[PDB]
Design a protein around this ligand. Structure first.
Ligand SMILES: *[C@@H]1O[C@H](CO)[C@@H](O[C@@H]2O[C@H](CO)[C@@H](O[C@@H]3O[C@H](CO)[C@@H](O[C@@H]4O[C@H](CO)[C@@H](O)[C@H](O)[C@H]4NC(C)=O)[C@H](O)[C@H]3NC(C)=O)[C@H](O)[C@H]2NC(C)=O)[C@H](O)[C@H]1NC(C)=O
Ligand SMILES: CCCCCCCCCCCCCCCCCC(=O)OC[C@H](COP(=O)(O)OCCN)OC(=O)CCCCCCCCCCCCCCCCC
Ligand SMILES: *[C@@H]1O[C@H](CO)[C@@H](O[C@@H]2O[C@H](CO)[C@@H](O[C@@H]3O[C@H](CO)[C@@H](O)[C@H](O)[C@H]3NC(C)=O)[C@H](O)[C@H]2NC(C)=O)[C@H](O)[C@H]1NC(C)=O
Ligand SMILES: *[C@@H]1O[C@H](CO)[C@@H](O[C@@H]2O[C@H](CO)[C@@H](O)[C@H](O)[C@H]2NC(C)=O)[C@H](O)[C@H]1NC(C)=O
Ligand SMILES: *[C@@H]1O[C@H](CO)[C@@H](O[C@@H]2O[C@H](CO)[C@@H](O)[C@H](O)[C@H]2NC(C)=O)[C@H](O)[C@H]1NC(C)=O
Ligand SMILES: *[C@@H]1O[C@H](CO)[C@@H](O[C@@H]2O[C@H](CO)[C@@H](O)[C@H](O)[C@H]2NC(C)=O)[C@H](O)[C@H]1NC(C)=O
Ligand SMILES: CC(C)CCC[C@@H](C)[C@H]1CC[C@H]2[C@@H]3CC=C4C[C@@H](O)CC[C@]4(C)[C@H]3CC[C@]12C
Ligand SMILES: *[C@@H]1O[C@H](CO)[C@@H](O)[C@H](O)[C@H]1NC(C)=O
Ligand SMILES: *[C@@H]1O[C@H](CO)[C@@H](O)[C@H](O)[C@H]1NC(C)=O
Ligand SMILES: [Ca+2]
Ligand SMILES: [Ca+2]
Ligand SMILES: [Ca+2]
Lengths: 96, 48, 48, 136, 48, 756
């Protein structure tokens, strides 16, 4: 479900620059988070937690899952995935 | 706390303990109210 | 002892007055100086 | 400028001393993306008949140059541009953005200056107790 | 201390949880045992 | 034939007796101008002296209050909103700003305005006492302005941060006020003496990370507090000391040497094990190098480190045992290391110890060593109080190119009775008055000279105080990297074309000598595309009283000028009816130079407006009136008459010629006339006659000059205006030689391409 979803953010329209000091995952559709007037959703950004927390490899996914098992930082993933994909179904992955 | 389901998620995040103490402080008195809440002054939240 | 000023340099209530310069990345902002208590402290047995 | 039109006859004219150049620096100049280099060309030998043979790659261009005496005008007659191909290194007279002179060399040979003669740098009565360590 | 010695001198600053000294290493290890913000310390160790 | 060249000469002889030829004795002209500048600067210095005396006395009589109840100090804070419609001990003033064309801003002459920078709180006990005792300065400010109504600014930069300048004007205009009066070049100039600073940067491993960024920022900010009289070199040491940049000994703090040092500092990396005995032995040896030029006083070492364990007593006992070198130690960064040894280094060696834990402390902790450096001059008594003038720099309040005279203010409480001297060895602040370069330019008139003659002034460093080639723009320092506080320091050799003889003339001016030097030089044209080989005469004299030297450049033909006659009221009307706006149809479209003829006549950038104003003024009252310049008006009217007689009697006979598009005439008085009325719209030259490149080029040439048109420009090219050829008018009156005008034509391209 979550492979590579967290690499897009609110880049400035004119330049390849992050809009704010704290970026968040974005989307091009209404259910996902939408960029403001001055920005657009561009392809590549490192990701949350400097790219350490993600689902890109099976190794990255296993480490990411183990972090949620310890109940430490799991809500940040829930909110990030909600920004990328909408909050309709993401609670079905994390609550179980 | 806006909806029943948004409330349950808050009580599940706190049950696991994700920064529940900061949520408690955010709910205290003297917080801005919603635009459509019908209250035009910064009188929201409780010491409860 | 759980008191702080938003400006790091000022370490007393009288000094913590006025405005100070906050140096963020590639931008300088002027912010007010406030003498405020920490969120969780020990000022009485109930707060402890 | 003739350098940006025919960039071979121009440099040959400079070389055989038809013209002369003398380059300076502009420090109060504005740039688009600043010190700026400037170049100006002027008559040097101030003699009239200037004829020679310009050499292109595997071809020769023969030219004659004559100068009007009552005006600052030169009539330069070159055989042909297309016949003999020379390398087209444009000679631009316009002002070019540049770094100034290398500071290292200038400070090896500094310009003459006379510094102030009065200086108050020591006094026996001075109190050095305010060192700053015990004061905080 | 051996794995993460003077490696926590980041440009922003040295985190309070670092392994530079033995008193600092014990309290950083103790925090990971209690499992509070163990992931945040992991990010610094990976970043270093 | 097309542009009358013999006709103007004949006109100039045949209308003799309407003007006289007067000499330009360069020796007298330069001395008159030098004494005028001396009197101006002495007038400016008297105000500083009386401000310093009054401030010292008033502070000495002050009583240190510690509590202020409601309104107790009344002052106008210069950064306050004018309409708040609404403090601990202060009551604001609501001032009325009317206008002043002398300043350009809106000012109030009623009281002084206070600037308190952003960091410093205005309710402090040390700020309220300043705001009280400094309120006595307003009477002296008013007295200075009333004695000399030409004073621009009178600031009192205070050691606490606040500044009081007399004409109360709002502070300038993101937009975060970072101004601090204690870092401006005039304050730094007046607060200490020239230094020989050697920054010693620690680049061992332990300073890696945040400490390194703080160190680089601190070193840059320290470099910003250095003048051209100061010499600086930056070294670094992990285990062996080395120079950070290509410089090896010591370099004066130019705007460019400082850039090289800053760039070298911004590219250092931290790796190694600290060795203090090898860095200090390097600093002390570079402070002993006397093969190079240096300030030769105030030898100081600034150590930027974090903390250590070695104090290195042997190095200090070996190199600095008579204590001729101060040592300032900085403990940069947020860390936990031993700080005792670096405090001991400052304590032993007549220095001070500073701490920079974050970016916000850099400015304050890098500007404070001047307090230490000012002790010996405070103890010098009434002998360190000399007025000193700064480099040319752009004013903070948008006033243009100004220089500032400074005078330190001492603390003398408990001096009448022998009570206190411990804290009295610190200046209260620095006085300062601004004189604009336009004042100095007013004191050196240039309209009795040819367009090729000018004045210029040199300070001991060789920079220009006056030059035609000095523009109100900051000095460029290098190529502008992709993605108003510096002085405008332009050397004489960088303002002109360097020459072997010029390098000698400049040295003689710096030494403070006077002489003449006639020689064949190489002058560059106004438009910066040509060079002429002119013969010029440099006459210079020292501005006695100050350190400046004035010089006057004059070509050979500019030794005489035309002085117009009084004539009579009949001739004034007949000459002035020629330049009527409706009348340049039979006379040719006329321009007039925007030179100030009267105080009331206002200069405009649109020559039609100025010409209308000039015409209506001449119509009003009489051409000769008080509050005007009789010579300028008479010269302009004479030139108008000569030009009108030319254009009518000659050009009106031949309306059209085969090979010309427009005939023009430019004369010294100020008048430009192009014969075809339709051709006036194509005339792109400056209405000021003394600023036309072709006029200046044609003056240096005894033959015809072809001025090439511009290529790929928005204006009409060489197809609708033509190609300009100009010839200078040369008249022989008595035995004298004069060149009062230049005529020419714009040859149409089509006729000449057909004739070619
Ligand atoms: C020019 O020099 C003169 C003297 O050379 C100088 O006048 C002196 O100014 C100081 C202010 O710094 C006055 O200080 C007195 O000292 C007491 C005792 O310290 C202070 O009371 C407390 O002091 C502590 C530090 O010890 C400090 O926290 C704070 O200053 C005070 N705290 C509290 C809670 O009160 C007072 O500051 C002050 N006492 C009184 C009764 O005012 C000296 O009194 C001044 N000396 C004289 C002879 O008047 C003057 O400031 C110099 N000029 C400038 C511009 O600074
Ligand atoms: C039921 C009694 C109490 C049971 C508790 C027993 C153990 C407690 C465990 C608590 C479990 C937490 C359940 C969280 C449910 C969903 C939480 C959530 O974030 O909802 C997101 C999704 C969006 O819907 P919502 O946000 O309400 O409104 C529409 C747009 N804002 O909302 C949805 O679409 C979800 C709709 C269905 C959810 C449940 C069925
Ligand atoms: C520093 O602040 C002080 C407190 O405001 C000022 O001292 C006060 O100045 C007043 C003048 O406006 C004095 O009022 C006059 O004092 C004379 C004494 O000879 C008396 O007649 C009256 O009290 C009064 N007269 C009139 C006609 O107003 C205050 O006495 C005096 N002292 C106080 C209030 O304690 C200082 O002036 C100020 N420093 C500076 C440099 O302005
Ligand atoms: C500046 O222009 C002058 C004028 O030509 C140059 O000086 C001459 O240089 C040539 C060689 O290029 C010599 O043969 C002449 O003897 C020089 N003339 C004099 C009077 O010395 C000069 O080289 C140019 N450049 C600089 C930097 O001065
Ligand atoms: C330049 O400074 C050095 C020392 O800083 C002076 O020392 C001399 O250096 C030259 C180099 O070969 C030699 O004569 C000796 O090594 C030194 N002579 C001494 C110490 O008497 C040097 O004299 C200075 N330069 C000049 C020209 O005096
Ligand atoms: C500075 O002072 C000198 C002398 O003190 C002035 O020069 C003198 O000028 C008079 C005539 O004006 C001569 O008779 C003297 O011989 C000169 N003295 C010298 C040259 O030592 C000089 O004029 C003063 N400066 C200015 C700008 O006037
Ligand atoms: C079982 C619970 C209700 C009993 C405990 C009572 C105490 C701890 C709580 C419950 C209800 C609370 C009150 C509810 C509402 C307000 C209004 C608020 O603007 C000020 C505080 C005040 C007055 C609270 C004070 C603390 C309070 C009295
Ligand atoms: C921002 O985007 C919305 C989307 O339609 C648009 O209506 C609005 O005008 C935009 N705002 C600006 C300032 O362009
Ligand atoms: C100097 O000041 C006096 C009076 O203050 C004035 O008359 C004189 O013209 C001034 N000289 C100048 C400004 O050169
Ligand atoms: Ca937790
Ligand atoms: Ca937990
Ligand atoms: Ca070290």
């Amino acid at each position: 479900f979550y492979m590579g979803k967290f690499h897009t953010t609110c880049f400035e329209e004119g330049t390849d620059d992050i809009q704010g000091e704290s970026p968040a995952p974005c989307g091009t559709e209404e259910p996902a988070r939408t960029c403001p007037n001055g920005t657009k959703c561009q392809p590549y950004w490192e990701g949350p937690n400097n790219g350490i927390t993600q689902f890109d490899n099976i190794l990255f996914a296993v480490l990411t899952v183990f972090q949620c098992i310890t109940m430490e930082g799991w809500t940040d993933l829930l909110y990030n995935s909600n920004d990328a994909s909408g909050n309709t179904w993401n609670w079905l992955y994390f609550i179980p | 706390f806006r909806t029943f389901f948004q409330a349950l998620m808050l009580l599940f995040r706190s049950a696991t303990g994700e920064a529940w103490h900061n949520i408690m402080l955010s709910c205290l008195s003297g917080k801005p109210c919603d635009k459509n809440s019908g209250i035009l002054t910064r009188e929201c939240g409780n010491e409860f | 002892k759980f008191f702080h000023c938003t400006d790091e340099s000022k370490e007393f209530e009288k000094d913590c007055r006025g405005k100070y310069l906050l140096y963020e990345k590639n931008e300088v902002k002027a912010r007010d100086r406030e003498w405020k208590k920490y969120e969780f402290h020990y000022d009485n047995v109930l707060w402890a | 400028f003739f350098g940006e039109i025919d960039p071979s006859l121009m440099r040959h004219l400079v070389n055989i001393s038809v013209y002369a150049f003398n380059k300076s620096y502009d420090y109060q100049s504005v740039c688009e993306p600043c010190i700026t280099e400037q170049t100006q060309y002027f008559f040097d030998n101030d003699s009239k008949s200037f004829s020679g043979v310009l050499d292109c790659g595997n071809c020769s261009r023969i030219f004659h140059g004559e100068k009007l005496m009552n005006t600052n005008l030169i009539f330069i007659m070159v055989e042909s541009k297309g016949t003999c191909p020379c390398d087209t290194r444009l000679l631009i007279q316009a002002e070019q953005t540049s770094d100034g002179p290398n500071p290292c060399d200038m400070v090896k040979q500094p310009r003459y200056r006379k510094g102030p003669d009065v200086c108050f740098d020591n006094n026996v009565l001075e109190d050095y107790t305010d060192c700053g360590g015990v004061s905080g | 201390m051996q794995l993460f010695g003077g490696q926590f001198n980041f440009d922003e600053g040295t985190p309070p949880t670092n392994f530079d000294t033995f008193p600092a290493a014990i309290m950083t290890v103790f925090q990971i045992l209690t499992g509070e913000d163990w992931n945040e310390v992991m990010y610094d160790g990976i970043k270093s | 034939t097309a542009s009358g060249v013999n006709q103007l000469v004949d006109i100039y002889e045949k209308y003799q007796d309407l003007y006289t030829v007067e000499p330009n004795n360069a020796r007298q002209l330069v001395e008159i101008a030098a004494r005028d500048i001396e009197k101006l600067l002495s007038n400016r210095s008297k105000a500083l002296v009386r401000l310093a005396l009054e401030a010292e006395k008033v502070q000495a009589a002050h009583q240190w209050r510690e509590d202020f109840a409601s309104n107790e100090v009344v002052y106008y804070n210069a950064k306050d909103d004018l309409d708040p419609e609404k403090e601990p001990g202060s009551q604001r003033i609501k001032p009325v700003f009317i206008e002043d064309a002398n300043f350009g801003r809106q000012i109030s002459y009623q009281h002084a305005a206070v600037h308190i920078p952003t960091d410093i709180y205005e309710g402090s006990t040390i700020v309220l006492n300043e705001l009280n005792w400094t309120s006595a300065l307003d009477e002296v400010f008013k007295k200075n302005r009333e004695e000399d109504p030409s004073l621009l600014w009178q600031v009192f930069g205070s050691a606490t941060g606040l500044a009081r300048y007399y004409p109360a004007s709002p502070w300038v205009d993101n937009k975060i006020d970072l101004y601090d009066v204690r870092r401006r070049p005039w304050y730094i100039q007046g607060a200490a003496s020239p230094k020989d600073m050697l920054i010693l940067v620690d680049v061992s491993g332990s300073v890696s990370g945040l400490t390194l960024k703080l160190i680089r920022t601190s070193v840059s900010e320290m470099l910003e507090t250095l003048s051209d009289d100061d010499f600086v070199n930056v070294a670094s040491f992990n285990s062996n000391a080395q120079d950070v940049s290509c410089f090896q000994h010591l370099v004066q703090a130019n705007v460019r040497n400082k850039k090289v040092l800053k760039d070298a500092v911004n590219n250092i990396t931290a790796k190694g094990i600290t060795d203090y005995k090898k860095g200090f032995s390097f600093a002390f040896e570079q402070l002993l190098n006397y093969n190079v030029s240096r300030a030769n006083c105030n030898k100081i070492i600034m150590l930027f480190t974090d903390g250590g364990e070695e104090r290195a007593q042997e190095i200090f006992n070996k190199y600095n045992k008579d204590k001729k070198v101060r040592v300032f130690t900085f403990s940069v960064g947020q860390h936990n290391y031993d700080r005792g040894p670096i405090q001991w280094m400052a304590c032993e060696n007549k220095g001070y110890y500073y701490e920079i834990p974050s970016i916000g402390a850099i400015r304050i902790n890098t500007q404070e060593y001047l307090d230490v450096l000012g002790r010996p001059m405070v103890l010098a008594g009434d002998k360190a109080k000399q007025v000193q003038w700064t480099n040319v720099y752009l004013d903070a309040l948008e006033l243009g190119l100004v220089i500032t005279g400074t005078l330190p203010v001492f603390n003398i409480t408990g001096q009448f009775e022998n009570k206190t001297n411990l804290k009295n060895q610190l200046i209260l602040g620095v006085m300062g008055v601004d004189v604009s370069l336009e004042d100095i330019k007013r004191l050196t008139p240039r309209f009795t000279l040819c367009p090729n003659g000018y004045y210029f002034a040199i300070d001991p460093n060789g920079y220009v105080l006056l030059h035609p080639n000095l523009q109100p723009k900051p000095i460029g320092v290098g190529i502008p990297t992709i993605n108003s506080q510096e002085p405008v320091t332009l050397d004489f050799l960088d303002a002109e074309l360097e020459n072997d003889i010029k390098v000698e003339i400049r040295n003689k001016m710096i030494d403070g000598e006077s002489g003449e030097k006639t020689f064949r030089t190489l002058v560059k044209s106004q438009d910066e595309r040509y060079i002429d080989k002119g013969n010029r005469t440099y006459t210079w004299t020292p501005v006695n009283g100050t350190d400046y030297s004035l010089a006057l450049v004059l070509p050979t033909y500019s030794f005489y000028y035309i002085k117009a006659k009084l004539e009579e009221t009949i001739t004034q009307a007949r000459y002035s009816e020629t330049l009527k706006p409706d009348n340049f149809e039979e006379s040719g479209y006329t321009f007039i130079a925007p030179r100030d003829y009267c105080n009331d006549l206002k200069i405009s950038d649109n020559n039609t407006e100025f010409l209308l104003n000039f015409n209506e003024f001449i119509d009003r009252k009489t051409p000769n009136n008080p509050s005007c310049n009789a010579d300028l008006i008479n010269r302009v009217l004479l030139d108008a008459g000569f030009t009108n007689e030319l254009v009518q009697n000659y050009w009106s006979k031949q309306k059209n010629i085969k090979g010309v598009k427009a005939r023009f005439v430019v004369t010294d008085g100020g008048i430009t006339r192009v014969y075809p009325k339709e051709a006036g719209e194509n005339w792109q030259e400056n209405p000021e006659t003394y600023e036309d490149s072709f006029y200046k080029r044609s003056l240096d040439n005894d033959n015809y000059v072809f001025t090439a048109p511009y290529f790929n420009k928005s204006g009409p090219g060489a197809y609708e205006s033509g190609i300009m050829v100009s010839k200078a008018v040369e008249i022989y009156i008595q035995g004298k030689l004069l060149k009062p005008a230049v005529v020419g034509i714009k040859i149409d391209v089509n006729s000449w391409i057909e004739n070619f």
